[PDB]
Amino acid sequence: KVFGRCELAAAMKRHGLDNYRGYSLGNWVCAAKFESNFNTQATNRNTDGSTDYGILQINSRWWCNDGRTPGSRNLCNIPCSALLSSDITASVNCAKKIVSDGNGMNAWVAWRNRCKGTDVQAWIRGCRL
Ligand SMILES: [Cl-]
Ligand SMILES: [Cl-]
Ligand SMILES: [Cl-]
Numbered sequence: 001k002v003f004g005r006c007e008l009a010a011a012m013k014r015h016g017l018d019n020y021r022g023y024s025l026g027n028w029v030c031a032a033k034f035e036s037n038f039n040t041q042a043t044n045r046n047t048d049g050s051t052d053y054g055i056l057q058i059n060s061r062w063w064c065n066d067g068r069t070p071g072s073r074n075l076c077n078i079p080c081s082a083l084l085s086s087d088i089t090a091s092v093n094c095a096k097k098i099v100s101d102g103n104g105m106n107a108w109v110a111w112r113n114r115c116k117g118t119d120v121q122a123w124i125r126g127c128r129l
Pocket of ligand 2 (some may be wrong): 072
């Protein structure tokens with residue numbers, strides 16, 4: 001599913017992501033924009049052989065099981081395929097664990113490089129929330 005901008009903001013809020021660990025909704029929408037362009041089915045293969053999955057490009061080295069990332073963990077206790085669903089529940093619940101891991105949203109390199117320090121509220125501007 002490719003979400004609309006406000007549609008995704010609303011879904012993220014519904015699932016308790018808004019201001020989670022102090023990160024406003026615009027941060028999460030911005031991260032999703034640059035990680036996946038709001039496409040739940042986004043996948044990308046990393047140089048280390050791990051894969052990133054879903055709207056927030058969650059990585060199989062630590063967070064989910066895909067059966068093909070040697071030496072990896074599955075800390076969210078989910079198949080990576082769950083992160084591709086039209087229902088963002090699994091992605092949100094896993095993101096909550098990731099952002100609580102110590103480095104906040106810096107875990108998403110694209111958030112650090114493209115969202116951090118910017119006017120992230122622009123991402124939820126106009127949205128009925
Ligand atoms: Cl915001
Ligand atoms: Cl594996
Ligand atoms: Cl980047």
